[PDB]
Amino acid sequence: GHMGNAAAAKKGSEQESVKEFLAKAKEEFLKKWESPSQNTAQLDHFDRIKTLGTGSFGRVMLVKHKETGNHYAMKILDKQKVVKLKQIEHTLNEKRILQAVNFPFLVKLEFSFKDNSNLYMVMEYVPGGEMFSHLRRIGRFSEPHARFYAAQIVLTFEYLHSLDLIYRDLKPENLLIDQQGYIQVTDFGFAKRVKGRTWTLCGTPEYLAPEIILSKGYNKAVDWWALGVLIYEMAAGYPPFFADQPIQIYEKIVSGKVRFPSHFSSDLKDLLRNLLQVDLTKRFGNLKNGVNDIKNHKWFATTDWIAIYQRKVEAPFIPKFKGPGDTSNFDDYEEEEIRVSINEKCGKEFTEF
Amino acid sequence: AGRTGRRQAIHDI
Numbered sequence: 536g537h538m539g540n541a542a543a544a545k546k547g548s549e550q551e552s553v554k555e556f557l558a559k560a561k562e563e564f565l566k567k568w569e570s571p572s573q574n575t576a577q578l579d580h581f582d583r584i585k586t587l588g589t590g591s592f593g594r595v596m597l598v599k600h601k602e603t604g605n606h607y608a609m610k611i612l613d614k615q616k617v618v619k620l621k622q623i624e625h626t627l628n629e630k631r632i633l634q635a636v637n638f639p640f641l642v643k644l645e646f647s648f649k650d651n652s653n654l655y656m657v658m659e660y661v662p663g664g665e666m667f668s669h670l671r672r673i674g675r676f677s678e679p680h681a682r683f684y685a686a687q688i689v690l691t692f693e694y695l696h697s698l699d700l701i702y703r704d705l706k707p708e709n710l711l712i713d714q715q716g717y718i719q720v721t722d723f724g725f726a727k728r729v730k731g732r733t734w735t736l737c738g739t740p741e742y743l744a745p746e747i748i749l750s751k752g753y754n755k756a757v758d759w760w761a762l763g764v765l766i767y768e769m770a771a772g773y774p775p776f777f778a779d780q781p782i783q784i785y786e787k788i789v790s791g792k793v794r795f796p797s798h799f800s801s802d803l804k805d806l807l808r809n810l811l812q813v814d815l816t817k818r819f820g821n822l823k824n825g826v827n828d829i830k831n832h833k834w835f836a837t838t839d840w841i842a843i844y845q846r847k848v849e850a851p852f853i854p855k856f857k858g859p860g861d862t863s864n865f866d867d868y869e870e871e872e873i874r875v876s877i878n879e880k881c882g883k884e885f886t887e888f
Numbered sequence: 889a890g891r892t893g894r895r896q897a898i899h900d901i
């Protein structure tokens with residue numbers, strides 16, 4: 536076979552230990568999922584510094600906690616915009632999931648609260664910037680560099696999917712680089728606890744699996760498709776289904792045809808053809824062997840999965856950090872003062888937040 | 889040709 540006796544037994548034991556880890560992680564998650572935290576701070580506890588990124592419902596700002604002086608990233612959502620965009624359920628998903636998960640590559644939620652106008656989620660500040668910026672600046676990542684990041688996403692999805700959580704918005708814009716060069720996944724706005732199928736048409740066009748575009752009930756395998764898109768974009772510098780307008784992007788995705796740069800290794804192309812697989816009976820991550828089809832693929836042969844989890848692998852890139860609260864690794868955005876009404880808006884819709 | 893700037897999520901169709 537491919538593995539000798541020693542290698543086979545080591546791999547088997549490793550895979551059993553994964554099951555043991557995930558069973559304990561589920562027990563811990565369920566305790567927090569059934570008894571969530573709420574109202575752990577208030578707005579006047581923080582000084583607002585600078586906008587770090589924007590979204591449809593608001594922005595994320597660097598804030599400084601007045602009492603402790605610690606810096607945080609505060610996501611601000613305008614309740615009125617959330618209701619109009621039918622994102623009430625999604626925003627409740629985001630907060631509930633973030634408060635209950637625990638993994639080295641998932642951003643940590645520290646506080647959450649609401650006022651008359653807005654919802655607030657206060658997270659650890661990750662100063663190294665978005666992967667997106669670094670990728671666009673350099674052009675592309677070499678295969679070992681891309682593989683280091685991809686391995687962290689594989690482990691993060693193995694964790695999330697074991698908890699019946701689908702992520703649904705993988706892309707470089709949502710992956711921050713920490714002070715050690717490791718990934719922090721942010722933006723749980725589309726994450727959802729799903730036992731089997733779900734039906735919402737949501738995500739980012741370039742990263743959507745064909746079954747989403749085709750209005751099928753879909754499952755966690757959409758995240759494994761998106762991993763294929765991410766790995767391709769990291770290694771090529773552009774995604775595999777690339778067009779100016781969403782309708783044109785969707786047409787390319789459902790055709791299934793993928794072309795690869797001549798510099799892609801054959802191992803990489805083989806992995807990507809198995810992730811970017813339109814037939815769900817053949818897509819890696821959706822088969823009997825589960826995540827192991829990905830983790831044991833030749834492209835990951837040099838990956839020490841435990842060492843990645845333990846953050847003991849030397850990172851390919853360490854962001855420059857000029858001190859606590861430095862924002863040099865983030866782009867600039869138009870600033871807008873946070874307005875808080877004298878009247879409570881959308882109170883009944885956000886009671887559980 | 890395609891989109892090189894930051895890409896916003898979509899909530900429907």
Ligand SMILES: O=S(=O)(c1cccc2cnccc12)N1CCCNCC1
Nearest residue numbers: 587588589595608660661708709721
């Ligand atoms: O970088 S963020 O501002 C950001 C979000 C969440 C937590 C963060 C923690 N540290 C820095 C930046 C953070 N961000 C928001 C814009 C939409 N794309 C995701 C990135």
